[PDB]
Structure 1
Amino acid sequence: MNIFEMLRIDEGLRLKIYKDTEGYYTIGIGHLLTKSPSLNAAKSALDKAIGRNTNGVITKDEAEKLFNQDVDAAVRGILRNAKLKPVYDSLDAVRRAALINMVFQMGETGVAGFTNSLRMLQQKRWDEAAVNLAKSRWYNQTPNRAKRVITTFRTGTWDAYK
């Protein structure tokens, strides 16, 4: 079990532009295309991303390529940030994985934003963080996911993914 696997579970695969729980045009394994209602905008975003005209559809490999990127970014975004690094470096491997998630999902910014939790993580207050984590647009915007990750943070294992 790994991060790539984890996110697959949490985002699965789709080779056609679809919307997300929220409503955002996504594609591949969780690759947000754009916050615009415009499909023409996501169709736009897509192509651009891919390198060709796609009419809104791609290959398993294209999907899987973008996934590689997204993940990197996400970790790259984690390293380039004074707020996050300290955490990460504090974390066990399994927890470094849940954190990579959070960043994959919301982004460098949104998560640097969970000031207290990030604190509670570093202090190693698993439970506490847990409930802290529990109230925040997030969790009650994508709760089964939150609950996975919050669990991964909790127990520091893969029981919720298994």
Structure 2
Amino acid sequence: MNIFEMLRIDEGLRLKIYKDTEGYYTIGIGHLLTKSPSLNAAKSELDKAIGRNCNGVITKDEAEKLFNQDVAAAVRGILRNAKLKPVYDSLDAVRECALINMVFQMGETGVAGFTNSLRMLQQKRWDEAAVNLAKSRWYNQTPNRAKRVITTFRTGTWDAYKNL
């Protein structure tokens, strides 16, 4: 297990534009296109992202291409974020994946707002951090994925993803 396999379990793979758990147009492996309710707006974003006329449909290779971009950019952005960088660097490589997963789902700003949980993670107070992470819109709206992510933070193991 690694970050790519983890996010592929959590996000799935779809080759046509669809609506994510928040109702927003998405494609591929969790590639958010737009928060606009306009499918045309989402289609324009898609064509821009891939560099061709897709009218809402991509290939698996294209989906994987966006996915690696998105993972790479989530890591890079964490390392440029003053709140998230120290936490990332303090964590072992398995727990780092949980942090990347959260950024992939809710964005850097949203994760950086988890001030108290971030502190508990930096302190290696794993059970306390796990309790705190669950007191969130995040957990309420996607509880089973949040549980997996939280278990990864709490344990530093892949037990919540072996075998999905």
TM-score normalised to the size of structure 1? 0.98
Cα deviations by residue, 1:80-133 (Å, 9 ceiling, x for unpaired): 011111111110110011111111111111111100000000000111111110
State the Cα distance separating 1:144 from its structure 2 match: 1.1
Cα RMSD, aligned residues only: 0.7
State the Cα distance separating 1:65 from its structure 2 match: 0.2
What secondary structure is seen at the aligned counterpart in 2 of 1:18?
strand
Q: Which residue of 2 aligns with 1:154?
A: 154
What secondary structure is seen at the aligned counterpart in 1 of 2:26?
strand
Q: Which residue of 2 aligns with 1:100?
A: 100
Q: Which residue of 1 aligns with 2:53?
A: 53
What secondary structure is seen at the aligned counterpart in 1 of 2:86?
helix
State the Cα distance separating 1:22 from its structure 2 match: 1.2
What secondary structure is seen at the aligned counterpart in 2 of 1:15?
strand
Taking the aligned partners of 1:65 and 1:103, their CA distance within structure 2 comes to 18
What secondary structure is seen at the aligned counterpart in 2 of 1:66?
helix
Aligned length: 162
Contiguous gaps of at least 5 residues in structure 2: none
What secondary structure is seen at the aligned counterpart in 1 of 2:33?
strand
Taking the aligned partners of 1:127 and 1:105, their CA distance within structure 2 comes to 22
What secondary structure is seen at the aligned counterpart in 1 of 2:19?
coil
Taking the aligned partners of 1:21 and 1:89, their CA distance within structure 2 comes to 30
Q: Which residue of 1 aligns with 2:74?
A: 74
State the Cα distance separating 1:24 from its structure 2 match: 0.7
What secondary structure is seen at the aligned counterpart in 2 of 1:16?
strand
State the Cα distance separating 1:39 from its structure 2 match: 0.6
Contiguous gaps of at least 5 residues in structure 1: none
Taking the aligned partners of 2:155 and 2:10, their CA distance within structure 1 comes to 18
Taking the aligned partners of 1:147 and 1:38, their CA distance within structure 2 comes to 32
Taking the aligned partners of 2:82 and 2:36, their CA distance within structure 1 comes to 31
What secondary structure is seen at the aligned counterpart in 1 of 2:17?
coil
Taking the aligned partners of 2:48 and 2:23, their CA distance within structure 1 comes to 21
Taking the aligned partners of 1:121 and 1:11, their CA distance within structure 2 comes to 24
Cα deviations by residue, 1:43-82 (Å, 9 ceiling, x for unpaired): 1110011101111000111000000110011001100011
State the Cα distance separating 1:159 from its structure 2 match: 0.5
State the Cα distance separating 1:135 from its structure 2 match: 1.1
What secondary structure is seen at the aligned counterpart in 1 of 2:37?
coil
What secondary structure is seen at the aligned counterpart in 2 of 1:56?
coil
